[PDB]
Amino acid sequence: WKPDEQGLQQILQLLKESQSPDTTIQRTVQQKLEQLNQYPDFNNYLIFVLTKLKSEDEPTRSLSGLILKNNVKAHFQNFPNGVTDFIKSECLNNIGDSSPLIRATVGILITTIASKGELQNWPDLLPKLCSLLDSEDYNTCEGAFGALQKICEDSAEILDSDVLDRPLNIMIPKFLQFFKHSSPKIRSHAVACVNQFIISRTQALMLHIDSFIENLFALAGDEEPEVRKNVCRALVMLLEVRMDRLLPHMHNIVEYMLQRTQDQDENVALEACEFWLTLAEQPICKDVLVRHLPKLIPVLVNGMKYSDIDIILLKDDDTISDWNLRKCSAAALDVLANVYRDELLPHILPLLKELLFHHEWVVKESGILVLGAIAEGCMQGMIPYLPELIPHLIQCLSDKKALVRSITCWTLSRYAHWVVSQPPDTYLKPLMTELLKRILDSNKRVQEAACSAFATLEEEACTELVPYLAYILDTLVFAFSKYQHKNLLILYDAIGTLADSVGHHLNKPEYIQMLMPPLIQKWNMLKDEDKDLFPLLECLSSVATALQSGFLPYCEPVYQRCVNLVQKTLAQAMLNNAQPDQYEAPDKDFMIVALDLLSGLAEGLGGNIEQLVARSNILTLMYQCMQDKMPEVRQSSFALLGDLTKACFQHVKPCIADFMPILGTNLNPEFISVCNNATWAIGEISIQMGIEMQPYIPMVLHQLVEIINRPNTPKTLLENTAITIGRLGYVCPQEVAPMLQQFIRPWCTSLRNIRDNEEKDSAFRGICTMISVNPSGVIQDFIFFCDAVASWINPKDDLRDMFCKILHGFKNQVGDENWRRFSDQFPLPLKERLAAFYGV
């Protein structure tokens, strides 16, 4: 039990100077301070000063303890036992000191110690805390519950784990009791503690569920913010876990939450507003809320107004917090919009008229925000009003207030689809014009919005942008020489998208001369170790695909570096996997973007890439990439494989027997994108192998057939599954034809909804081949085939004839009148397609 008078005065004076106004004495004394951390006796002084030295002032005492806390955050593995126990002993004995600063300091010590040493190393803590909970003195009980809150906040799953037993069996009923304590501060702690176990649906709470709801309900109208706040969090969380026990009280909950969404306390308001988001997700919502709508919308729409503090912090990275009342309200509107569709328009429209034109800009802004927020869910019933609203918004892009120009960009972008479905001179042309001006706006936030809006518009406009390319590139490349860094991400996006939308139309010497110099500038000046390459190479993978042979001037150095990036990454992984202590783990993103650039490189160049592939280790590398533990890396490698298979199969063919085992084991639909690119690859390969695919059919086909009949499977994955089955059937009809029955339905349903293209052509040659081989595969579901055949606008002649031989085949097989009875199912446009295009 050592104080030591020599060492005592040495630290007391070193604590003094660590409170000095100037940094010169501060930073040198802090250096000279925790460098005394070498001694195993040092941290004992610190607790002693905090708890046992009454002769010293509280600021000094408090600080000494906080330094001791910072000596557990870092340097706790090097803690001696007797020290640790003695600090633990002095804390629990003083957990509720009469001085609030000392009480709080001792508080956070207990919180950090019991955090760093998980909670096997203080098994005396929890039982002693629950004991100190029934304490006759307030300060002790307040101090205990306060540590119990932080502990619950830090180690919820650790307390629900087996690692310390299941002490929640007794703590849940214990906390619930203090819901009725007369102090507001205690009640707060109690609900906060219980709140930490709602989501994980902790069993200890689920048997006390009703008495939990009861206690909470009795606390709902508590006048103390913190309590109201914590009740709101609980009710909200409880919507996701125990919606059964909330349904009978639902209308009372919602009415309460409306009273709470406009709470006089900002925190409560925000926590209440969460309710509408969560509720919006439950399938019940659609009919439980209809009656509350004319009261909810105005509450949301008023919350979407910029809180005046936002105005000044907007107009370092000048940004508001991730999560606001405004944002939450806007989010809830967007989700409710998607739940009610047009049925929400009567509730909102009157408000829009009032807001959009309003003279105060803060109000106008929120109107434009609303207009964008409802855009997705309320689209079909918004269209009638759009020939007036768009030209209005286009004018607002010139409003003097920057934040108005901001959302106007966004809101227009949310109606981009409609805009392009119109004669371009009246809506698309002027929108584009003002957006281009705005991309170069003096305001950072406006550029961000304008550039994004333009990107959205480009996806929607496509080739309708071709005539305007000279102007577009001019401003995009200028922005390139101006845009800071955050905005550069968006700008790269806008260019890649440009290229994706216009494709080959970008391949003109005048456009290349504009677009390429600045990208090469960026290229040459960034180092291989620099993460600014990510958005660059990603951008280039789009530009290369679009430029096609216009890219030849640049292709070799580009191909050269991508292979290097892939090689330096794999190599770094093995020097890490065999020697973690010496070599650091590589960032796999370098490898991803390099694979991706290689992709768009094979796609833009086709057969011209072959010489670059022949004199490279790309295949050997790719084969390693396809085995990476990271799915995103497998994903990119399969896309590249599909591409090279198309570009230069002669260099891939030797590897097929090696590749196919890997592709075959990556048809797990839990990994959507990996599965997708594997399936696409298997397809392209099969076209190149021809009859030689025969060995692999039994290895993949049934996986594909399971996937295509699997519910809740994304539509594009379904699409490539359909394509690849088709392509496997084209080359191995004998092997694939017998499954005809098992895939024809979703195959047709999937492929009837895609544009006529080469892959669609590829797949239908297959389905046709399999049909002439196994006609009985389609007999039972021939209607699906007819509808899929009809989904074609302009089929090639031979394909059109193949469709025709088969249709007449069955008509002339089943009979004259037999066809009529079967054709009576056809919707009008179908019955009339087959008769006009194929002669029934």
Partner: peptide
């Protein structure tokens, strides 16, 4: 994949 501007997000 997020990079484009949004005044709010549906999934925070």
């Amino acid at each position: 994949p997020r990079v484009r501007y949004n005044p709010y997000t549906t999934r925070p």
